[PDB]
Amino acid sequence: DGVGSSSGNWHCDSQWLGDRVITTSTRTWALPTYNNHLYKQISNSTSGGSSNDNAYFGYSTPWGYFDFNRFHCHFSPRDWQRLINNNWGFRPKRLNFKLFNIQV
Amino acid sequence: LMGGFGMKHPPPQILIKNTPVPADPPTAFNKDKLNSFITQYSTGQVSVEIEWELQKENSKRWNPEIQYTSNYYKSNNVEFAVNTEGVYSEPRPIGTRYLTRNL
Incomplete structure (x- = not known):
């Protein structure tokens, strides 16, 4: 939309229906630039690793990711x-994800 | 004051009696009330069904609360269970107040 409008609202509650629970979590994040915008080959050589059990080869990326x-x-x-005292079981059903109020 | 729900019209009293069954009366009339009866008693079953309305907890409290629990530690008997002789017992008084509210 625009510079002066919020693009989303804080929603953190939880909602207990009969057989359903809906959790909602809002957090504030910060994202640095990683790797100076570069992809980099990495290995146990680049980190100085020794033992064969710990050897690896891979890449680090400029990107970052969300883990909930x-x-x-x-x-x-x-x-x-409230979950563990009252219930024999639970499983996840649906997911909704939002990014908003971005500030560079 | 002993606790519970005060009512102008509480659950009514339910009164029960074995009806007297006379023993053999004399064969000449006597005006006295009969004091001689057949020895008698009754048995049966009673059902009581009560519907209770609940008020749920709405709390926003972050930390976990106090709840009534059984203790895991080993014991000769199970609490609120029957004895080895068949005697049911209630080991502790249990109130209702565990969850919390703001004041």
Whole structure:
């Protein structure tokens, strides 16, 4: 839209329906430039590794990524208590992801 | 004051009695009330069904709360279970107040 408008709102709550729980988490992030915008070959040689069990070859990228793959990202400790004391089981169903209010 | 729900019209009293069954009366009339009865008692089943309305917790509290629990540690008996002699017991009084609210 424009410079002066917020592109999204903070939504952090959790919502307990009968057989469903909807967690929503909002955080503030910062993204540096990585690798001076470069792709780089990396290996245990570039890091000085020695043992064959630890040898590797790969690439580091200028990119970065989001990880919400831990439960404390989505559940407050109270919500976790509420889950584990009342339920025999749970599984994830849907996912919704948003990036907004970007500031460079 | 002992706790619970005060009511102008509480659940009504349910009164039950075995109806007296006279023993053999005399064969000449007597005006006295009969004091001689067949020894008697009754048994049966009772069902009580109560519907209870609940008020859910809405809390925004972040940290986990106090809850009533059983303790895992080994014991000769299970709490709130039957004895080795068949005697059910209640080991502790349990109140209702665990969850919290703001004041």
